[PDB]
């Protein structure tokens, strides 16, 4: 039962050189495995980059190699670029069959960059379904670490609430999120205070932006 | 100009079949190797078998070798993906990719991708999502930037698509990935930040569209009256 590796995620600074490897739970990465490497950017755009364990595909800039390292295939770019964001894809070819790995999140470190805090109260034609939806909106910030609490007047709410992330933006390499506070149109209105308390390391104290439950 | 076009996506029922389909173009599709390459909802990608130009050798990955029939039409630039015994573990986004086959150097590479075609196997019907406003919290007068957006929720199954003024709106625009609520349904918001002064003269107008419950809507959003 073959089980293709990588390290789940890197990070690296503009410029840096940075190693991705894959490693087979069989034993020792050999040129026999023809290890190749695949690129995802955002939207399921995926692109071969190495073929043959250090061949590289045609259009891929020289940074991009390929070796041997250790019982393991390895991906090696160097001098990274903002470009470089996305997610790496090794596979082995195991006499019969092909074996992709896990895939490793590759992060181009950037400066510190504090969200744009939203807040959204449910629209009125929601209400009418009988269910309310409050959003809260993060916008382009980076590190991704973000904490986003919801209190409603003042109760830290719990398990009622999920959040989605973007991926790096390519530009900016920030990240964007936003999390979703669901109530029954009831306690909607038992309420009156409705805030999202973010936190940040670009915040020196924790925002908050909130609304009174009808107040226009 | 390597064009990689699948389709053939959508809800299937457990224990039923489904063909999926690729166009190609751009290259001399009779010269090379296809392959099949599914990715289930939190999975990394997963080869599901290759053919060789001829149709005379058809790799399989160990398991599906029989649920999974891979084929091709050289004629009509096509490759096609018989599926069966369909079970929940076959949802999933199914990718065309085009295989530079070279044993000379043993050099073998999925070069392009197709942007996959979605396939959820469910006993769930499919349903069209709602599509709530997330109207401006802001005015002209507080000068800068507002953000606003559209809350599509309670659908099912992926995906959604969603444009901004039929596609006109681009820069600004931020669609999250769509999250599997507790009823089983999926939602999703998509949010985009424009110059408060356009705030009653430019019109903001989010496109869904949801082929699978055949829904199209074009909801537009303004700033709630107060
Ligand atoms: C991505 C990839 C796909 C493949 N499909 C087949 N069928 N082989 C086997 C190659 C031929 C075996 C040989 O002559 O060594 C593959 C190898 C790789 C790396």
């Known amino acids: 039962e073959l089980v293709v590796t990588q390290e789940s995620a890197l990070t690296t600074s503009p410029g840096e050189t940075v190693t991705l490897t894959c490693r087979s739970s069989?034993?020792?990465?050999?040129?026999?495995?023809?290890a190749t490497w695949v690129q995802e950017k955002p939207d399921h755009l995926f692109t071969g980059l190495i073929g043959?364990?250090?061949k590289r595909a045609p259009g891929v800039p020289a940074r991009f190699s390929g070796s041997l390292i250790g019982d393991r295939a390895a991906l090696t770019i160097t001098g990274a670029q903002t470009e470089d964001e996305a997610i790496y894809f090794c596979?082995?070819?195991?006499?019969?069959?092909?074996?992709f790995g896990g895939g490793t999140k590759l992060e181009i470190k950037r400066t510190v960059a504090a969200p744009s805090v939203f807040i959204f109260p449910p629209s009125d034609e929601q209400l009418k379904s009988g269910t309310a939806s409050v959003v809260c909106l993060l916008n382009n910030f980076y590190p991704r670490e973000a904490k986003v609490q919801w209190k409603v007047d003042n109760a830290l709410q719990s398990g009622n609430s999920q959040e989605s992330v973007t991926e790096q933006d390519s530009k900016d390499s920030t990240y964007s999120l936003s999390s979703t506070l669901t109530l029954s149109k009831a306690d909607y209105e038992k309420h009156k205070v409705y805030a999202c308390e973010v936190t940040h390391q670009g915040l020196s104290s924790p925002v908050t932006k909130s609304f009174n439950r009808g107040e226009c | 100009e390597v064009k990689l076009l699948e389709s053939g996506g959508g809800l299937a029922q457990p224990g039923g079949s489904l063909k999926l389909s690729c166009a190609a173009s751009?290259?001399?599709?009779?010269?090379?190797?296809m392959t099949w390459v599914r990715q289930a909802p939190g999975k990394g990608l997963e080869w599901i078998g290759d053919?060789?130009?001829?149709?005379?050798?058809?790799n399989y990955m160990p398991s599906l070798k029989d649920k999974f029939i891979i084929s091709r039409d050289n004629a009509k630039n096509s490759l096609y993906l018989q599926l069966s015994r369909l079970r929940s573990e076959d949802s999933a986004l199914y990718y065309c990719?085009?295989?530079?086959?070279?044993?000379?150097?043993?050099?073998?590479?999925?070069?392009?991708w197709g942007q996959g075609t979605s396939v959820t196997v469910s006993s769930a019907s499919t349903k069209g999502p709602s599509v709530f406003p997330l109207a401006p919290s802001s005015k002209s007068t507080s000068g800068g930037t507002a953000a606003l957006g559209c809350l599509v929720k309670d659908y099912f199954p992926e995906p959604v698509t969603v444009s901004w003024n039929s596609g006109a709106l681009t820069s600004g625009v931020h669609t999250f990935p769509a999250v599997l609520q507790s009823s089983g349904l999926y939602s999703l918001s998509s949010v985009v930040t424009v110059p408060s002064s356009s705030l009653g003269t430019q019109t903001y107008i989010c496109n869904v569209n949801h082929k699978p419950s055949n829904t199209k809507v074009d909801k537009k959003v303004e700033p709630k009256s107060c």
């Open positions: 990719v085009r295989l530079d086959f070279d044993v000379y150097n043993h050099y073998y590479v999925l070069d392009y």
């Open positions: 751009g290259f001399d599709f009779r010269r090379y190797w």
């Open positions: 053919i060789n130009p001829d149709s005379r050798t058809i």
């Open positions: 069989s034993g020792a990465v050999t040129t026999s495995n023809y």
């Open positions: 043959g364990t250090n």
């Open positions: 596979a082995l070819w195991n006499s019969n069959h092909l074996v």
